[PDB]
A paper describes a structure:
The 14-3-3σ protein, which has multiple interacting partners with specific peptidic motifs, was used as a case study. We have observed this phenomenon first-hand with human 14-3-3σ, a protein which has several hundred known interacting partners in the cell. For example, the 14-3-3σ isoform (but not other isoforms) specifically targets p53 and is associated with tumour suppression, making it invaluable to determine crystal structures of the target peptide with the correct isoform.
The first step involves the growth of 14-3-3σ crystals in complex with a weakly binding c-Jun peptide (cJun-pS227) under the aforementioned ‘sigma’ conditions. Structure determination of this complex reveals electron density that is not observable for most of the c-Jun peptide, with only weak electron density appearing for its phosphorylated serine site. All models were determined to belong to the orthorhombic space group C2221 using Zanuda. The condition most suitable for crystal growth was determined to be 28%(v/v) PEG 400, 5% glycerol, 0.2 M CaCl, 0.1 M HEPES pH 7.5, 2 mM β-mercaptoethanol and was used for reproduction of the crystals.
Author numbering:
A (entry chain A), B (entry chain A): -4 to 71, 73 to 231
The structure:
């Protein structure tokens, strides 16, 4: 790998600089190099990995949605324009799939198997569900159902651990539940499960806020608002 | 080149799709492929080329400024942090220089020499001044003065043609004058020349607005406002 000659600490330092410069592709490459050093990631380092790839894939998903919509309209009274829209949508789609496969590969070799604490294991399993979810958004062929089930299975294992090992206000647990609820609504055609999950998560967090410091209260209530935003949109 | 097998029309079509998807690196690559087909560019195609590269280099310049500022602070009571900030600033700088060299290469081979109409020749010479200006922003060594003079010379030839062949409200002429005034203020250490140029350009355009249609009036007054914005900032 092209980061093989750079010190782990320097990769982390440069990932933080790339974040400040909004250079998320660089940030992701630096964090991939850091993961490939083979040592486990601290909490801050895990967040850097997630921020980098979420931003890279988020731009790819936004572009794919623009191009997919143009492609949809072209296939309605619409004039034939040739293969270009499909080709370019496919190009962006293949790039997106490549990023998802890269992230999933880092999780499989070997972040998840070395993650023993609940906070790291839940974090990585949530990421696995997220990146299979992004693959599912663009899937159409023989493995769409298997891709969806891979996302479900990762989210489910993360939920089981998070419920047993974390308080209901833990921001990792809240963000996992938020994303699993989105999976239910957007991927699994299960809006009732999505609503039930978001509501139960919100209510159980509400009841636990009294145990928190002012700073933790701020952290948890911010994610609760994201759950509330979805419930308002979905109900 | 990787676009050598794609039709010129398909490259143009995909450049427009990439713009809609805010995929400016792709847009630039498509427009580079279109230029390399060897045919002259229409007015719309010239604008696509400029939009693509302006957005790519604009992101690089913003990142370089962030990293340069961090580097400045590190060299003031500041703790020694190693070579990483300089290395990463250099990496972004080298990428930026590569983009500028790519654009300048397309202008030199062979867009400028085939551009005979004032509107195309002024457009390309303005681009030449712009991309030498971006090189000058990061230059420090033996050729900084020669880089600055290359920007000046391109802008000056574009100004001479634009003054002889275009009305003072022409949006190309206005945008050239805007950028040459920025060159004077930011690159050539000539704020009085920058102010004089912006003011004279604004006033000569004002006096010509009566000749324009409603749509052309809108086009010209928008760029005049950019000149006014700079004058307000600089005076
Ligand atoms: Ca080492
Ligand atoms: Ca028709
Ligand atoms: Ca052809
Ligand atoms: Ca100190
Ligand atoms: Mg290396
Ligand atoms: Mg119901
Ligand atoms: Mg090709
Ligand atoms: Mg004075």
């Amino acid at each position: 790998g092209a980061m093989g000659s750079m010190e782990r600490a320097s990769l982390i330092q440069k990932a933080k600089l790339a974040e400040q410069a909004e250079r998320y592709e660089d940030m992701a490459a630096f964090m991939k190099g850091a993961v490939e050093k083979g040592e486990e990631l601290s909490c801050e380092e895990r967040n850097l990995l997630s921020v980098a790839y979420k931003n890279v894939v988020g731009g790819q998903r936004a572009a794919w949605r623009v191009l997919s919509s143009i492609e949809q309209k072209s296939n309605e009274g619409s004039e034939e324009k040739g293969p270009e829209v499909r080709e370019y949508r496919e190009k962006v789609e293949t790039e997106l799939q490549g990023v998802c496969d890269t992230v999933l590969g880092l999780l499989d070799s070997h972040l998840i198997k070395e993650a023993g604490d609940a906070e790291s294991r839940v974090f990585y399993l949530k990421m696995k569900g997220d990146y299979y979810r992004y693959l599912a958004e663009v899937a159409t062929g023989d493995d769409k159902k298997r891709i969806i089930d891979s996302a479900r299975s990762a989210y489910q294992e993360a939920m089981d651990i998070s419920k047993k090992e974390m308080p209901p206000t833990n921001p990792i647990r809240l963000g996992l539940a938020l994303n699993f609820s989105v999976f239910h609504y957007e991927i699994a055609n299960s809006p009732e499960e999505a609503i039930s999950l978001a509501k139960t998560t919100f209510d159980e967090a509400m009841a636990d806020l009294h145990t928190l410091s002012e700073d933790s209260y701020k952290d948890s209530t911010l994610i609760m608002q994201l759950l509330r935003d979805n419930l308002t949109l979905w109900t």
